[PDB]
Amino acid sequence: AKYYNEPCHTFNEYLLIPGLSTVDCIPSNVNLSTPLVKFQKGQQSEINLKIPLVSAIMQSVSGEKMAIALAREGGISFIFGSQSIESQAAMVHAVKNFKAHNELVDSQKRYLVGAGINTRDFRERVPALVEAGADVLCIDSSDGFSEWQKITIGWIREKYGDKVKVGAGNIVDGEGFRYLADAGADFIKIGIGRGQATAVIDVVAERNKYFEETGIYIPVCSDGGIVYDYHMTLALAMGADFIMLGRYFARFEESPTRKVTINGSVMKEYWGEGSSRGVDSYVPYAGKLKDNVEASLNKVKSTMCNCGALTIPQLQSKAKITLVSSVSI
Amino acid sequence: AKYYNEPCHTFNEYLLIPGLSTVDCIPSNVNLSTPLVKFQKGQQSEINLKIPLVSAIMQSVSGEKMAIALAREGGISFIFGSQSIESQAAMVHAVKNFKAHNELVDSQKRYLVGAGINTRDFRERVPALVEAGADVLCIDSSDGFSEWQKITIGWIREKYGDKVKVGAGNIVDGEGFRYLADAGADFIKIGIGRGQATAVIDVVAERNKYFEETGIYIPVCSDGGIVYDYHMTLALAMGADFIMLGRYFARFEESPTRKVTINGSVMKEYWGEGSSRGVDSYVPYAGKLKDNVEASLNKVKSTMCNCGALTIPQLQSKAKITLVSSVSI
Amino acid sequence: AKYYNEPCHTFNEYLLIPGLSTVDCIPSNVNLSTPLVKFQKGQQSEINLKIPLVSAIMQSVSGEKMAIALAREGGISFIFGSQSIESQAAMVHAVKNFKAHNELVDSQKRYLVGAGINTRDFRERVPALVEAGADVLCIDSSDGFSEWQKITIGWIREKYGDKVKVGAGNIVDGEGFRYLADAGADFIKIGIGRGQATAVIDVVAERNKYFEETGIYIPVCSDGGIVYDYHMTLALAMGADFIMLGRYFARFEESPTRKVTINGSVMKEYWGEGSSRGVDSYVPYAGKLKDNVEASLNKVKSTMCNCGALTIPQLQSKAKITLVSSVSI
Amino acid sequence: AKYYNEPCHTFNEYLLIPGLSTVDCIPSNVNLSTPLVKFQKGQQSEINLKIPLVSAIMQSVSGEKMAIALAREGGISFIFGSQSIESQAAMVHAVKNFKAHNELVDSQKRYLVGAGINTRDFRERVPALVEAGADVLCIDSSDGFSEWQKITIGWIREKYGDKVKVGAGNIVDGEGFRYLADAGADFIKIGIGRGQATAVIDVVAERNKYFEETGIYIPVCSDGGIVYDYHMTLALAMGADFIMLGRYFARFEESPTRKVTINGSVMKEYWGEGSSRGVDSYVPYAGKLKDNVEASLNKVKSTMCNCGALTIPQLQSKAKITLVSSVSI
């Protein structure tokens, strides 16, 4: 067996120590754009998000209403692939053709959308999603450190080359990152076997090494493990380019689930992809996406300024991160 | 006094980090056979289990019905020795002659059975068990780091040579392993004075050193400390060849205890060997052994594939084990 | 990102190990004077407190009655600046002209008072406070590691030179201390992004380095994080010259808030500066300031003698501080 | 300030790892004698206890009935000095002249008794205690790292030389041990500012260094912090010669307090020396001392044999002590 010295930590065991704030660092001046897909040294990503938030590839969160509402604020949704190929493509088409502000829009001024895909029916599913207008694809899996991901990406590259953008994984260490990077993934999702903070720190380190070695920068996504807005700032500071959230978005008016009034409290349904529908429960109703996202990002921008950073890249180089003692928590 | 630097950890403080999964790694392809008794370099163990699970040497778990049901699935039971020599031998005989699938069977196609023995009446007890047809014996003790174990094994070797297989101990460090290894034990039980995970890791390390030094491989058994199926995978990954469980098997229809309906919930009786019958309580009734064991082992096989291993030996060399922070738990 | 090895600790994870107590170390002989403002090698601070306690710059704690009561015991209050410039100046004037024992008094035998100021209206506010008779000023901010603090101090030095004493900050590391030290702050407040004990230890270390480099000693203030009297002794031992407390003083008869009887228990109102009035709650009523402060300081003096120190400076050099294990707490 | 790297641990964070048990190690063969007072290389202590247990210098535990009952089993009590000199001397006299088995008896076959003394009235108190027949004296104090202890011991040595045995302290580190050792203390009490286990380990280390340097062996006493019988074995293994217990003995029929029946449960009164009578509560009634002590020591003897030791000195050299993880607890 191979053992690891330091134990892995969660986002709750960390704190950002303030840096120097200049007079020009005010929330309104903070830029939250981030690259969504890989590019090489000297270039910009073909797709850049206006806000570093993306919605999870789930039935209870990423539907057409969520996709439209999120794209309007600058983020992107990955319509769930846990439905028929015909239904998913229909949903993708619905978002693309909806029209007829930090809106994430394409050349034809249509909202951007991503779609989740699996390692089984990709041959039939990918073409349908591409035809429907999907802007980005992401292989949905809790453990993407497998041949199956390599094969799926390979088929896509053979059939479409670099025309089709495929995100992949859910790896927790540099070894898994490296494997998917070589396989051809446009961005890599982090999160499973390891505390979220350590996973991010380790993968980002490998990602940086890979960039110095190949000149190719692959954006990484922290998927889950975020319990508070502060954790959002921490994930980005540690090197994640954007964050994927499930429960956070399922509370909104736009999530596909039903609102349920349980003795005074209005809730929304929420179940996991691995549920027999994994969990099935409720999240407190929070209203419309816009107002909530705005509240969250305003707090992220302020924290960024406490760290003396006007952009995510600055935050990532300037951030002073410290571990907190168990007793302190 | 002699002090130790790192504190000992339990199985709950560890996590397996995924390795590369090949297309050929599917639960159905995973082989769970393990050696039960020592053998030397270039040979196979005389006895190999089909599944790495063995039932505890207890009154509330290892009876004749349990022995038959477990042997049928590929494991083995150690009939409790906390009864008369005549009763225990009768039970051994009952299992051996029951007949008249991963069944653990002998040359005459009879189910395999083990029996627990103590360091007191072995002179009268061993012969009776051997005559009755016992396939393996195990010295039952919570602290086997004593002269008494050496003496008992010695008597057996003098009287029967290597014809009779005796398991021994319950040691927690390499020093105790080494002592019992030299004494002649065919396999060594781990578990007491030390967190289960650390105990396993340390003994296995000594076991490996001993194998390189003598060419003799002695299988080790993690006895207790397993609270979940995942812990089963962890114990094997850390180097244990098979696991001994008590409470796990006492829930089944086949354990020797009484089913008790306590206001809606059907339970089964469970008491420790050191009880005044140690504890005396209840475990939730789980039904027949077969269905439960199958559920557990299916989850072990999947995890193994997440680690990219098709056999226990591969798991033991490929496993990437990390410690988890206190706060993460 | 920049990471830190050791995690930060709170005051609860520390213990003072006794030193040699001489026959001459009795509570009555302990001297609790401390410097409030910076001075250079070979000189005494222009202002020295008789007791190391100062009240927080809050609406629910630092009013005119509190200022008079605290100054009478040897400490000083910083009248809150979260009110109009006219009101705050009036309050300052009220304390200065109240007259017509470890009393902290000036040349004209008038009680000493401090006032909180912000980085916005200082141009209009500072002159009013100075004219009103304010003895010390302190920039109120949770994160003072910013250009805004430098600018405010700079304006004051340009307009008044070293005639006006300005405290600043709320930094948690040496880098923030250094910045405010160079900016011209007369004393620096510690406390936010980092466990209180570690913050104090790190800043004090920098403060000591700065003193050796420039010959200027800048007194530091531990603001908050003190839950018990013992923590008071710990903060001073670690190097803090004086302590700022909010909740502690809000319990007294002299705090500006209302006494409220809640089913048998008399409480006092307490709300944070960042409340929509931050929290709004109650603290148990404790009576008059005098009797409580006396009880607290008597316990500090005894502990000091257990450490064999008759003054704070001796405590700071003689203290033997140890970390306590998580389980011990 | 002086800081310490490793945090201090309690007895709950440790475990004894078994050693080799020989056939001759049975509880009945274990010898629990320990030296009570200092002696030099090549000699035996003038006073040796038959069991390593001594009762605390408290009003709720060490009275004449307790002293007689404990001496009969081989231990010794230190009659409380928190009473008049006349009362304490009377109690000492009562035990000495009571007569008219591991009994701790003197030359005249009278039970042995100790008495607590303070650093104030020793001039009047010591002579009275000596005249009354006190066999050993102990300076009662929670922090004995002071000039006052040196002075008291000095007076005694000047007046009586080495004829009168005085125990001293309550120190937690080697520095405090060293000070009292040089002052002339016959034995030193450990326990306060530091986790009990670490305190014992550190003082014992200093005690060993002192013995190698001077040839004088000073017995150390672990005072308090023992919550279970296992902790007793741990304290001795770590190097403490004997243990002082308060609550443990206050449960017995022989403690000086009142038995109180509180709705079905018979309790005994228990208050601390620093109580306004410190705490005042109840401990569960346990019956007569004999039966309880016997149960405790039988468990200590067995554990000793699991460590392969027939005497305390063997235990102290053979013990394999490991730290346990926070999560394991």
From Swiss-Prot, chains A, B, C, D:
Molecular-function annotations in GO: identical protein binding; IMP dehydrogenase activity; metal ion binding; nucleotide binding
Positions annotated to bind NAD(+): 140-142, 191-192
InterPro entries: Aldolase_TIM, CBS_dom, CBS_dom_sf, IMP_DH, IMP_DH/GMP_Rdtase_CS, IMP_DH_GMPRt
Subcellular location: Cytoplasm
Activity: how regulated: Mycophenolic acid (MPA) is a non-competitive inhibitor that prevents formation of the closed enzyme conformation by binding to the same site as the amobile flap. In contrast, mizoribine monophosphate (MZP) is a competitive inhibitor that induces the closed conformation. MPA is a potent inhibitor of mammalian IMPDHs but a poor inhibitor of the bacterial enzymes. MZP is a more potent inhibitor of bacterial IMPDH.
Presence of the UniProt keyword Protein biosynthesis in the record: no
Disulfide partners: none
Catalytic reaction list: IMP + NAD(+) + H2O = XMP + NADH + H(+)
UniProt keywords, alphabetically: CBS domain, Cytoplasm, GMP biosynthesis, Metal-binding, NAD, Oxidoreductase, Potassium, Purine biosynthesis, Repeat
Family that this chain belongs to: Belongs to the IMPDH/GMPR family.
Protein name: Inosine-5'-monophosphate dehydrogenase
